[PDB]
């Protein structure tokens, strides 16, 4: 809708606007356009202003982060973009700038971007069972999440990537601690533990209680991380196949190496529909239900697409099961 054509990395006013909503089609963009989107978020949220981030350093940092993501079917730079874009959408939807400080927004955004750095495409169960260098280094304690974290701080230690260079040491330590808590909280083995702790605080929630806010930030990063099904069907659906592509690579390797295989990774046991029905019903919907108690606007924007998705996979399951029965 402009008088002349601008290159892809110069985001159109329409893209800038659409970027604020969970309906944003994450598939339409090349890495350079996604990098421009992430950069806009830091300026738009007032993070460049409030933390005196050098605008060039922000770009170098984002480019370095992009480079440290692997070309995996799921755990890649586009996934990193989803999580950060969903976080950014949640800041607007939930009016997080009213409830959280700029330091908290910075932690939420930086942890969302860094949460899966250098992911190898094989989960913690593979690392542990195969006794990999990562499992040995981290003593079987969230090896991947600990690594994503370490890589995040290794990038920030490079002077041309240090977006925190103008932040006083006390501020840096505060951001570092918060980011470590958030990235480590993305380990799904801790889901029930984190959900229970949050629900316990939800009995009488306090926005001025640091412990309550830490748990809310952990729940927010967890929400964003597994949020694909909140997105429109056309955007959400291709992500399941990407994850299954990664899971099948792992189970094949586990079979070959004589290691235990998880049923949800077994090509003959798992179906996209049955895997998604369960995940939506027992992981996604209950998690977003607890958030809705604090942010009532999350029901219409995030629970409604989850209900629609659950109902569509139930339809797909009826057809898929009948189809798979003819195949034998
Ligand atoms: C098709 C996936 C099979 N999995 C079954 C399952 N059941 C119980 C426990 C674990 N998995 C649930 C499915 C699933 N996993 C997701 C999604 C998003 N992130 N993850 C994951 C969350 C974990 O970290 C990697 C991405 C999703 O939409 N579906
Ligand atoms: Mg992860
Ligand atoms: Zn992730």
Curated annotation (Swiss-Prot):
Chain residues that bind Mg(2+): 116
Chain sites annotated for binding Zn(2+): 79, 115-116, 225
Annotated residues for binding of 3',5'-cyclic GMP: 75-79, 116, 225, 247, 275-276
Sites of Phosphoserine modification: 142
Enzyme Commission numbers on file: 3.1.4.35
Enzyme class, spelled out: hydrolase
Keyword field contains Hydrolase: yes
Keyword Phosphoprotein carried by entry: yes
Cofactors, names only: Zn(2+); Mg(2+)
Keywords associated with the record: Cell membrane, Cell projection, cGMP, Cytoplasm, Endoplasmic reticulum, Golgi apparatus, Hydrolase, Magnesium, Membrane, Metal-binding, Phosphoprotein, Zinc
GO molecular-function term, one example from the UniProt record: 3',5'-cyclic-GMP phosphodiesterase activity
Protein purpose: Specifically hydrolyzes the second messenger cGMP, which is a key regulator of many important physiological processes. Highly specific: compared to other members of the cyclic nucleotide phosphodiesterase family, has the highest affinity and selectivity for cGMP. Specifically regulates natriuretic-peptide-dependent cGMP signaling in heart, acting as a regulator of cardiac hypertrophy in myocytes and muscle. Does not regulate nitric oxide-dependent cGMP in heart.
Family note: Belongs to the cyclic nucleotide phosphodiesterase family. PDE9 subfamily.
Protein name: High affinity cGMP-specific 3',5'-cyclic phosphodiesterase 9A
The gene coding this protein: PDE9A
Full-sequence portion shown in this chain: 242 to 565 of 593
């Amino acid at each position: 809708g402009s008088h002349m054509t601008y290159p892809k990395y110069l985001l159109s006013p329409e893209t800038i606007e659409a970027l604020r909503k969970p309906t944003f089609d994450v598939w339409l963009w090349e890495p350079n356009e996604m990098l421009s989107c992430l950069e806009h978020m830091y300026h738009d949220l007032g993070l460049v202003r409030d933390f005196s981030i050098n605008p060039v350093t922000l770009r170098r940092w984002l480019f370095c982060v992009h480079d440290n993501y692997r070309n995996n079917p799921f755990h890649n730079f586009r996934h990193c973009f989803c999580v950060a874009q969903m976080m950014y959408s949640m800041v607007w939807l939930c009016s997080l700038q009213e409830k959280f400080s700029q330091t908290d927004i910075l932690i939420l955004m930086t942890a969302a971007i860094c949460h899966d750095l250098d992911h190898p495409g094989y989960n913690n169960t593979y690392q542990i069972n195969a006794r990999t260098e990562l499992a040995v280094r981290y003593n079987d304690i969230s090896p991947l999440e600990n690594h994503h974290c370490a890589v995040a701080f290794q990038i920030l230690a490079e002077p041309e990537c240090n977006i925190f260079s103008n932040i006083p040491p006390d501020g840096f330590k505060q951001i570092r601690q918060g980011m470590i808590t958030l990235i480590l909280a993305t380990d799904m083995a801790r889901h029930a533990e984190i959900m229970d702790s949050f629900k316990e605080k939800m009995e009488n929630f306090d926005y001025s209680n640091e412990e309550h806010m830490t748990l809310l930030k952990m729940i927010l990063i967890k929400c964003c991380d597994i949020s694909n099904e909140v997105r429109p069907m056309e955007v959400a659906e291709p992500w399941v196949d990407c994850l299954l592509e990664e899971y099948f690579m792992q189970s094949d390797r586990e079979k070959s190496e004589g290691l235990p295989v998880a049923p949800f990774m077994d090509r003959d046991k798992v179906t996209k529909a049955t895997a998604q029905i369960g995940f939506i019903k027992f992981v996604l919907i209950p998690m977003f239900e607890t958030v809705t108690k604090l942010f009532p606007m999350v029901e219409e924007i995030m629970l409604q697409p989850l209900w629609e998705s659950r109902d569509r996979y139930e339809e797909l399951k009826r057809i898929d099961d009948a189809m798979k029965e003819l195949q034998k």
